[model samples]
Target: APNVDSTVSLKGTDVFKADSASIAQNYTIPEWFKDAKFGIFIHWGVYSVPAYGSEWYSRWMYKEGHPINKYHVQTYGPLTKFGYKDFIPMFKAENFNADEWLAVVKSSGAQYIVPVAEHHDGFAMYSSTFNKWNAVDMGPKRDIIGELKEATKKAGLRFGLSSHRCENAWFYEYGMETPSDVQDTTITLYGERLHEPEGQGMTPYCGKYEGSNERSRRQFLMHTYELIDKYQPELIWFDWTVGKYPFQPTFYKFMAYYYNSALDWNKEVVVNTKFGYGDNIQVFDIERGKSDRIREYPWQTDTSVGKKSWSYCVGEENKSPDHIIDDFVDIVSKNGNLLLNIGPKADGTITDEQKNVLAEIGKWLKTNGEAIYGSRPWVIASEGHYMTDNTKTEYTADDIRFTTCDNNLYAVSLAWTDGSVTIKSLATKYCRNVEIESVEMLGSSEKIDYKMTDEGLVVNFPKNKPTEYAHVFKIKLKGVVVSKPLYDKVDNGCLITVRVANHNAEDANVTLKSVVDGNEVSTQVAVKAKSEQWVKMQNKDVKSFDDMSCKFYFNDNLTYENEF
Candidate 1:
């Protein structure tokens, strides 16, 4: 049992502001941050020394016969003796030229840069006043964060940081048990080490990180305070919300301090949901991929040019520049941002292949900046068989996504459709036959022929295709508002039945409900009876509701109708 002073240490209480106004006085989002649609995120750290893969070094080092564990033992002896600490000095960052990196980021047309300040390994890449296990004091002997921040700002780009140190409580779970018994934490059944109570067993057992209690909560808070104070980054991405574990309340306190501190700096900051409330955070860094539907708030997806890894690994292949360019347009059209990652060799220099990919994307952005920057999602997200509904739309040679800004509409085709592009969604019924001021390909001024008809909008192209994978067309709209729908919901307020082709009764699971004023008011019913499947579901069934839209869902794509 620890005493109160040993637990509730108030040394870090100063990190929080006394009032909300005091904090708000400091932070505001600068225009440059918002206008900048694209950025590059680097995850290089001590873990890159081997460059075998990602940040799985700690986990792999513990597996008895695992390659990483075997490598660690064969190369550095048993982790039980030297542990991961021995690799610290090997991360020399010998070729880490910040200016060159910023130049590449700029050339790729990225307006911002974000690098991992710390991962779950608890190794800080910057000079930390609290922890001694930092790049400045241990490995590299240089200020990785400071140098990059200066270079990014000099290159006219916003700077951001990502922190994944929340998993430090179980940081050493991958070591040998006989040795780990004498170490900081032991690995649990789930592969995670148990910290707290120093040398105690994990949950099913009893012993865990003692400081994980209120005492350690303050320490974590202070740790984060040091990071925010040092970086003052425009964006702060957190890997795990402080709430996922026991010290959640303390995590909230730390977040409040961080957010409040940003206000004090007069800076507009964005925290990830992993840190807390989804809406409270400004930016959503969707890992891997994003939803087909547009989010109510601005979000970003972090992907890499390399298909195989986010880090530089031998024999790893990268995606072509053209493919990356099309990806940028596709995500941007849905009102989403793209944060691309590139891995450098263990020596800290970017691969030539990576540089070339970025250069090509930069050229594309330079020419098509007008269609991309500051653009809002168009009335229609996609065109043709690429309809948005319960149906899953596939991108074929003819499918394209659209976005509008000012008086221009950008139709980005993901696949080559010869010299002509057609959008069935813009049929004459809902679009005017207005004269087109110009039909130009994105990134080029070559004029093309276009016409709108009852069938769709078609654009006749030049003799050749500009690029493979995707092509973008800039259509200057004469007016801002599009034509209204010619038809209405006139099918006698009845229920509707829907089924996908080739689906059996057992495979078909359909649901219907009314969505109004952002609320689903009606009860959901399974369309089991085929006779009255098309009956209208109304708000009356719901105790309290008033909305005009109906939503239908199925295990498969559905075609249904409603009538009373």
Candidate 2:
């Protein structure tokens, strides 16, 4: 690998703010970030040296007879004499090449990169004026942050940072039975000595660090400022509560600084909810969890390729590419993004397995990027044989579900029940007029047969075999809008909350006509609607339109549906 020193500049950019409340009101989602649906997260640090169970080696080694414990005993003796500090010097970046890593990330079709600037072990990956134990001073003797920022820019990808240092205050305090019970009395990040009394069982350090004073928090803030001034990161991710740390005030102050700096730079920035309350947070990270329903705003989920650890470990098993891809599809269909993490080896190299996973994603994205990127959530959430709906019950996916973006709707199969794919969400009076131009498989251009029936819209495919793969049937509409109206719920006496979908603000109109038992009951006011870039509806006042099964119409190359 070539040795290079890189510098990143954020001059003449938008003034990006980190405060969610301020940003949401002042800014709209950026076009670049919205279209870039997938990202790659890198978790590389000193712990990568062992490639052991996890980054937990430092803490686990404090426990007697534990695996990392036993390994620590064998490799560097007991924790009391030669603790985690000893391994710091061993984390050499001999084969480290920032450009090489970023190249792979770009090739993988990842639009952004989030590297662990600091993990729970509390070691800063970059040079910190507040601490001497950092990448530049200790193990690597090179600036990890500086290198990645430059390489990422060269690759034309957004740069982001993740700080898990909040866990550091109490993370290493696990499993000690007494003050002198297990190991060294030397303090870690905060330099607070271990004060375990007999039978305390790591009591002193297990909870919040009592000695984590204002100075420590200021130190954290200073380092964060260093990152902001140097990298001008597009996104800043916090692992846990920014307020929970002893430096809560500093966190807020730094956040304000980051936002102010971003504004000065003239660039939009996103600060995640991990830092604090999500009131106006730009990004919502659904870590280790997926939502059951589609959301109104864009969100992201951060998961790992390996189930065992976020750092490369020997013999660690990874989720198959198909499963990961399917998960990505599921999230994208619901207006969400995926930030998949890959653990790098201690020496800054990715394993072949990790590379293969990324390559597969890149291949798929190259072909089907349009369907996933810049797409909005469809009107319906799902479609398949295993679906259920009734007057007394809400509809949900029994097998597969689907969502739509633009004129394209995706039928995602949760299971491979190959018969007729039924979409329950489309079963309504207003959906009756929806026109389906054609249907095809996502990866394949081959057209399939599709029809709307009394039960639901069904797509017939060639095969009925039970395959493990989650199939997607892409339905293309003639126009960007569709019209349908179904009774959602009674808001007031005979008045209902209507759900109108695929409505164009330019050429759509809505009216209410009352019908009872197939008979005309009353005439209501005609409501004028308009179109925006995307298909959505806004309510207009119609006092006369009450106690009626509402009907909506779409014309002028617009198709829409309304549920009253």
Candidate 3:
């Protein structure tokens, strides 16, 4: 295999020959990533200079009648005279301080950080031998990725990089229809493809360019390899558009090469992708949304601090710190991570609003981090529904989210419940044959009153509430709790709902079995710690079990056999 390191070496290796199937089979999600649970995402580039709209300014400015186009004409000049390249010099980033950025991220309770190395505008934030339109040769006149990588390591946090270059294939195609500067192929700033018709605007299909797919694919591979070789990021995040048909082969090749290189480096790495890869091969990243249910595998959500724009813009409406903290807690309870974003100005200083938001979150984490960090999802993610009017934030005091770590369960109330809280899910009817050791609030060491009843597990109110937004309760248990399943008769079949509970800190696999007419049918369900799931039984099995019994098998040779 050519010494593995010889051909897969990070330096000067272009064409990777490893098999994609092997890479997929060998991929594994590292423990650090699963335990970290939170990270910071930064999006800074020449696009920040304009900062009038979203990060799509470079593409929208060529649409002629679009708001960005009109604004570009009024603010800068005509598209023909003042092109997107003109904003390069304005992105000086004169006050960029890598140390300050890392310190802020560390203080925000983020164990990892990811910075965008390149956006769809075809401008690289790192020094790239394959492309000259980079930070070293252009506006920044500094290797932005290199500088951040050093400081991030010194801060004792894992570092990652994001790439949006795949969208560059059609990013500036709108400029081709007019007498814009994009027509000049010699200027690599606008990319090398020029086969599209003028005035039609950008096209989603990048395969239409005459004889350009192969060359563009190769260049993309080289650029990705260069980034991996130069930065050695623990995680590589790619934006949308890589799932397109034209880039599928390139995507697979990149994954294989990256996984193979990581093997040589002897370090655990992750690939953060929007689509085109299975969960077994890479981690799934949702753009601005989170999973509604508890996912068995770990996932991530990348959302910006500002609601209006990901990059700095005039009059941007930023999300309040309370909203961000609530969302972060909700995501953690569902067995997923949060990749929060921050947009710095062209001058390289973060906004005071963003700084305040991070500070508030950090302060909250200081008191409630024991329930967040290194915690797994509990059975049944959320316990309450939206209020009657459905006007205010969905999660109210009645809405409780759960997490578990080291035999300790945390019930976080989304809203203040007037100094008292009741968890119906912990009722004796639901959690059958379970004994609680003790219960207390997270921030305080004082023990409070609590008892299990038919109504639910009710606890006495403390004199002082720990924190605002969300309050957590630490419930210690003597042993694991098994939830009772509810059975119902359906159309031509019987339904059996099983709630697998993992009271310990780690995950547990529980198998449910039904024996009827001397025939045994079983289904295995993997449940996260302190989480619950529903499994279904078909009509044939239901009929067979009409005169039989049902049982559940736990890993430690424990069985719960109950008569129907």
Candidate 4:
């Protein structure tokens, strides 16, 4: 533990103010984060001591007719005698080592790590001045977040932290209803909201900014400000609750503060929320889900290794590395990142099953990461038969995903095959007469043979498989592969971002046209060879972004085109 001191108060930034327009104008997605396609999210805390249903054991144990409440009675006696707080003593992470955790995390081929700093259970994983129920003051007697932050930074990786404290507002409502240790005496840790029986306890919008939430607001702001000032984490991930009523107001303020604080620290930072914000503000996160199509802005999928729980528990079923990698490729194909979650035992030890999954993913990324890391989306996200809900992971050679980087296009097959495969997206006519420079497999040494027909680009595979989960083929194109123009309503006009995979040091003209009443109103933009560019169409003549179409031309020939 560093035993660091936090600031008593926060100050304003020289370049920013605590307002909406000011913060949104200056907030830009971190370039490095856009390139990092994968990261680690951990779940380890006092709840792991039970290792039962899930991390929601704290609330479940107090519910009247819940199974976990019955299990608590059967195993650990009555709730009045042995409450959730009793697990604090047993959460002695004797085997916890910063370097040991990072060793395994780094081996997973992740560029960043975000561990739970404080969960909805109300136990702080770091030292806290506002609250005494912390890992340093109670369980483990260590600054869990501090140690992990320092270790990850020393290992040359970015470190972020998660705050699920927003859910703590009503986390202990069941305890208050039953005969438990959570009471007025324990208000500091379990919160002080008076439950309204008919309303199912005080939700975020249940009470005004007075007795029920004034103190909560203060504590929440203080804790978040402390985390920002002391730890200086490059990213902060708030759970879904943060997007709700009371926290929504505070969320904007916190975002402005954190963005300005990042500038003062001279670092690029991001804020990930499960809800939507204004344009270019927060990075959206989908839990246990993915988008149906490619997202206009960068996004993330936060899924756990265990299907049932984010924390360690008995009877936990986990996802195999192969299936995870398949989903991972799909996410990356849509310009999305993955923050995989894992839970450790009560003694700060990871299970061999989870460790092996991480190792296998690392091995796969080592061979085929060019198709993932630092890659941008193609014109289309995927080309395959529509997947059934239950059979999403049952992939085939026909399920191909595309990514592009440094003038090369990548085609990743979701499943392995014995014979040949075809990519219909790369047909000569589909590419608009673009030539093919060459073709080669990512992890194979044998020369590749291919034929381009109107149907698709047919290629014969090598005898040996490079990696297990998926195989990537690199396609060097004679012309640039331009992305579908994604436009957003920003500042009175439409701001569009285009991603182009141009190999040589060349420039092209991008024409933006709006079709209204069977008339063509077009404007041209000069774009460089850089992979990404923001073309602002601030003209009042171009109305109704829904009727927009984009075309890219090299000299006099049309290279690629797309429509709204």
Residue 158 of model 1: what lDDT? 82
Worst 10-residue lDDT window for candidate 2 reads 1-10
Q: Per-residue CA lDDT of candidate 4, range 1-564, in tens? A: 211122112444535444567767778888888899999999999999989848789878988779999998899888888888788988999999988889889989999999999998889999888878899989899999999988998889999999988767777788877787775455567765334212223233434332236666567777788798779999999876665554566666677667767877889998888763654787888644444456768988888898888889878888999889999999998878999998999899887878888889999999898878899887667777665557645788888889888767899988888877888766543343356778998989988888876667887888888889888989886544444444566533455444444444566555554333234345666656634454433323445556545454333444445543
lDDT of 1 by residue, 306-369 (tens): 7888877777799987677767777776667788999888778999999999988887777667
Error of 4 at 66 (Å): 1.0
Residue 155, model 1: lDDT of 89
What C-alpha RMSD separates each model from the true structure? 11.0, 8.3, 5.8, 5.0
- Per-model CA lDDT versus the true structure: 0.61, 0.62, 0.75, 0.75
Residue-level lDDT tens digits of model 2 in 443-479: 6644567787655567676454322345667776532
Full ranking by TM-score: 4, 3, 2, 1
Highest TM-score scorer: 4
Clash count (model 1, backbone only): 31
Please, what is the TM-score per model? 0.74, 0.75, 0.84, 0.85
User: Which parts of model 4 are misplaced by more than 4 Å?
Assistant: 1-12, 194-212, 287-292, 386-393, 480-505, 509-527, 530-564
What is candidate 2's TM-score against the reference? 0.75
Error of 4 at 411 (Å): 1.1
Report clash pairs, candidate 3. 177-198, 177-199, 378-530, 378-531, 379-530, 379-531, 379-532
